[PDB]
Point group: D2
Chain length 116, copies 4
Amino acid sequence: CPLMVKVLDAVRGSPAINVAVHVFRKAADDTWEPFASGKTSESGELHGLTTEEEFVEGIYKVEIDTKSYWKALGISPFHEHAEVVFTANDSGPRRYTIAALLSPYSYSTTAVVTNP
Amino acid sequence: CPLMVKVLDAVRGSPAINVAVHVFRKAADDTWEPFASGKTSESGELHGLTTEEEFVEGIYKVEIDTKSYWKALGISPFHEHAEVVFTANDSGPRRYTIAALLSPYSYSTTAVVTNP
Amino acid sequence: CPLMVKVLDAVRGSPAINVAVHVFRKAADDTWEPFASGKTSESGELHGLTTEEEFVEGIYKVEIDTKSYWKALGISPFHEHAEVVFTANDSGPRRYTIAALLSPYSYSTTAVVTN
Amino acid sequence: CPLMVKVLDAVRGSPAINVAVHVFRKAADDTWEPFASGKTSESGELHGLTTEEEFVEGIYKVEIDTKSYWKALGISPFHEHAEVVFTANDSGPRRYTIAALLSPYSYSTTAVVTN
Ligand SMILES: *CCC(=O)Nc1ccc(/C=C/c2cc(C)c(O)c(C)c2)cc1
Ligand SMILES: *CCC(=O)Nc1ccc(/C=C/c2cc(C)c(O)c(C)c2)cc1
């Protein structure tokens, strides 16, 4: 609910399924602490990463494992991953959708931020 | 259901609401016949354009009225519209999502095609 | 060179070479009249489409033949073409670059308008 | 010029000027070591980051300071930065252009790798 990730494949015209996603949160000492992880579903979506209680203010990194996705499909892509880094919840709780559209040598990403 | 259009705003980080969309289908005489139209909802989505019976094989044009969207928000954009032209249903019925991500001087578009 | 077109390939990480591009100007009767055309170069670019004298204010359409490009690479694409339709306005910078980044089921386009 | 970075602005239709870019190379201990940096030019480009001799195979990260760019324009952005992380491979073409197209809540990036 408060953080969702959607991944699409621009080659196939389909959801990007079984894409690994790791989320980190910047700690007080400036290191990236593991926060949540999961894999996209057959709809290219990953829900259930966190709760509104746990998803406090901070700087978050959403790392989408695009290389493995191309690798597990047998293809050699350019990027290691796609990383999305942003401050969240700093004016109170919001809901965030992080969307990515993937090609072997390119990607686009956007955020949809809503106030419930 | 068989044709859906989703429009996002890359400036606001939000759905693009109240965006006019016109769909045309190429006729036998090579003119563009009006096929369906509507406006995106508060979720940036437009459903209910057509039915699987009416959505036959053909070449379709999805014209997204991006200029008015920037104009109705009081902004002067580059493009007149974003047009998406594609052959549909030529190997049998499919479901099509046409997605667009808008900026004042740029847009991206993708398709998600699924076989029910 | 008031109008340039740049086409890139997101699958191969390269310029999109030998892509047909047609430019049209909207006529008084609302039909699209051919204006200029060419094929992208080895660097994915098409220069020399028009001159300052001919490129007056108006609505233009740049049609990029993406379907033929993908088919020549043996890849099944979604779109018939990519269309970029815009107004040229003299109350803006003078040089327009229309850039497109192509994938089989997606494209991105931007304008770089400079003085 | 084996590595070039190009940054474009999707709101204004222009090069993204005076954007800070930092390049890092992944070290043996898995930390990111500074490699090269600069600010984009009036044409949105940053050349002269490295030489052929120094740009060996490896994993590189190009960090584009998008947040400062938007803030200088008085626009509230979403991302802290844009990150492009990739492997340089000698069994590929020799010149890498990393391009980024920026909006306040979105960015696109591509690689153009040529000989
Ligand atoms: C409305 C559908 C939904 O519930 N969630 C959802 C739909 C679509 C997206 C993102 C689509 C998209 C399209 C394009 C062209 C680009 O470039 C990007 C990055 C994302 C997200 C969420
Ligand atoms: C032709 C020499 C050169 O490298 N010039 C150059 C022009 C443009 C780019 C990238 C453009 C671009 C366009 C779009 C629509 C997207 O999404 C991206 C990421 C980049 C590179 C180089």
